[PDB]
Amino acid sequence: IDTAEFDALPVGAIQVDGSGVIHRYNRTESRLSGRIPERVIGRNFFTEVAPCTNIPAFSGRFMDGVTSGTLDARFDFVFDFQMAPVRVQIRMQNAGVPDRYWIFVRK
Ligand SMILES: *C(=O)/C=C/c1ccc(O)cc1
């Protein structure tokens, strides 16, 4: 996975670094969130863009994965947007490039 195929994925896909800063953000995720990729890239996913994820079930799982070198998690979650609660399944894992990590979002 590491362009037009990337924005056409059936699942949402976000690439972050070890401190949480967004490097890649696809269109499928933009469609599920309402966020434009250009103002979101360069900002921190956990502290700025998606604060609802700043709990031990999500950001804690991310922090532990980075600190142990291997990020590998699969869990159910619910995104608390302005309109209504959107139930999703999250898949977190490492990338082919060092210091880079992936967050996959489905449904
Ligand atoms: C909670 O604050 C979730 C926010 C959110 C999740 C995923 C995105 O792509 C954008 C915002």
UniProtKB/TrEMBL annotation:
Limits of the PAS domain: 6-49
Residues with S-(4-hydroxycinnamyl)cysteine modification: 52
Family: In the N-terminal section; belongs to the phytochrome family.
The protein's assembly and partners: Homodimer.
Protein known as: Photoactive yellow protein
Organism: Rhodospirillum centenum (Rhodocista centenaria)
Residues of the full protein shown: 20 to 129 of 884
